[PDB]
């Protein structure tokens, strides 16, 4: 699996994350920093939409007489005008925010792909479906290091070269 | 040996619309539009309304004989009339600036 | 009917106790109240498209 094919069920620890498999075990983990930052972003967005609304104590209804029909109709015009403006803006705002939010999340999962590729460089094969395969054998300690962003690339340099070289041809 | 990058998926069937696509299933969403209510009148900022019931504002202000139970309350958050008040003017006539009076009494 | 609660907004259909910015219960209200919208729903995405692998 991987972000290219679809999301994961069972990865309930966060919006974004990793799955790994090695000789010591396997399972899901959230990228806790990425997820919390994405959450803070979304939280600020939702709260901005809500908090910027000016809520004041009001008195909406107005009464009119038989010969105040023009005034009644103006009062109605005002309510319909404001209502169409707020309805149009609310519908449109939500649709626009939803397009950006879904794009935001797609961007963030790809950013994790770039985070890992940049960190691993050529010590892992890209699969193309959102996965990477190490050329070197990788235990639980290097899995944590990659997730942390502390992978000691030089440490595995020789092992990965030797494993890539299994298909080098002439040497 | 293998690291895969993914994202959350679950059993939710809620959907959203966007400008480019419609009926998109989403893992979690927030309804910003409130559609429920209590089905009953309540205390606005902790303060009860004046409930006129069968009486109209004119009934209560003029003191219609049938608005007797409405003349004991000294403060209110809002005024509530039944949808079509029956006890108002009991001796018919024009109530001048009635609509203005009801604006002035709207909060006391 | 009348009863007790902590209300912030009230419509003729009954009291509202809600923090959300919009409501579609009724156009005429009393009190500190969400804006009336003609729409049936304003669901904002916070999450991801729910498309499992």
């Amino acid at each position, epitope marked *: 699996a991987g972000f290219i094919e679809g999301g994961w069920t069972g990865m309930v620890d966060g919006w974004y994350g990793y799955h790994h498999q090695n000789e010591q075990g396997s399972g899901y983990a959230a990228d806790q920093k990425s997820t919390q930052n994405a959450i803070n972003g979304i*939280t600020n967005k939702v709260n901005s939409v809500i908090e910027k609304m000016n809520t004041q104590f009001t008195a909406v209804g107005k009464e009119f007489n038989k010969l105040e029909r023009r005034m009644e109709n103006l009062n109605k015009k005002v309510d319909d005008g404001f209502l169409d403006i707020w309805t149009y803006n609310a519908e449109l705002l939500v649709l626009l925010e939803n397009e950006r939010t879904l794009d935001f999340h797609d961007s963030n999962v790809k950013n994790l792909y770039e985070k890992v590729k940049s960190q691993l460089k050529n010590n892992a094969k890209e699969i193309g479906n959102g996965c990477f395969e190490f050329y070197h054998k990788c235990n639980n300690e290097c899995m944590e290091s990659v997730k942390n962003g502390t992978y000691d690339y030089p440490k595995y340099s020789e092992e990965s070269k030797l494993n890539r070289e299994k298909i080098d041809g002439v040497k | 040996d293998t690291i895969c990058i993914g994202y959350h998926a679950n059993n939710s069937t809620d959907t959203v619309d966007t400008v480019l696509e419609k009926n998109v299933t989403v893992t979690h969403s927030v309804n910003l539009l409130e559609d429920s209510h209590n089905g009953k009148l309540c205390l606005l900022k902790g303060i009860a309304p004046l409930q006129l019931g069968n009486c109209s504002v004119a009934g209560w202000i003029l003191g219609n004989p049938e608005c007797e139970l409405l003349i004991s309350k000294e403060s209110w958050s809002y005024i509530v009339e039944t949808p079509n008040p029956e006890n108002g003017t009991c001796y018919p006539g024009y109530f001048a600036d009635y609509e203005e009076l009801r604006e002035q009494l709207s909060s006391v | 009917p009348m009863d007790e609660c902590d209300a912030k907004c009230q419509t003729p259909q009954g009291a509202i106790n809600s923090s959300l910015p919009f409501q579609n219960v009724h156009p005429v209200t009393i009190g500190e109240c969400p804006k009336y919208v003609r729409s049936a729903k304003l669901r904002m995405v916070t999450g991801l498209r729910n498309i499992p692998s």
Partner: antibody
Amino acid sequence: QVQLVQSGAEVKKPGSSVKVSCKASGGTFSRYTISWVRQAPGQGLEWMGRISPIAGLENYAQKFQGRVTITADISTSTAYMELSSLRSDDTAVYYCAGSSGYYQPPPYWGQGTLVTVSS
Amino acid sequence: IVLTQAPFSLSLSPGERATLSCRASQSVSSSSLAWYHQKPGQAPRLLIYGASSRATGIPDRFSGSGSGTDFTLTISRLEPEDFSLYYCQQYGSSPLTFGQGTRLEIK
């Protein structure tokens, strides 16, 4: 800082369900993750689960995986824990606690409410 | 993950220094095992945020450190207020598991 207020104590018969509410005040509800913890009489704490009002990501302890539903609604600034198929084994004080982040321990614990399950 | 937080009871005189420690079957994420203090009848109070940060509002008598599968809480200048139960919580782990509870007695 957020302060949490819980519903009163309840007594239930075995097989019935309980819905324990929690309300937040003094801060922004939507900015805290709500985590529910069980205090067994005479014993320590057990985690039951958590919810983020904005992110969802409901996460439940395995023991109650098919029994407890945790919800939140930013509309009322509350969270609920609904536990089905009650057993006498479930007598405990249930605490609502807030956390400043999804991956942080909660420093803002509520009152705790006792739910007793008995004949 | 299995957390074994209460291997012993502890009995101290006020003014003394003592430590408590937690062990686990796997690593508690990265330095993410929190410490709690519970006065009978009260909700648990957070003392240590993560393996070692002091939680806001907590006195300087409390400190701690650790990593992996082995963490320690130290209390110096112990006061009557401290003679209650202690717990560990794996807030950085998938299940947010809690320890058993250790009790500190007054001599």
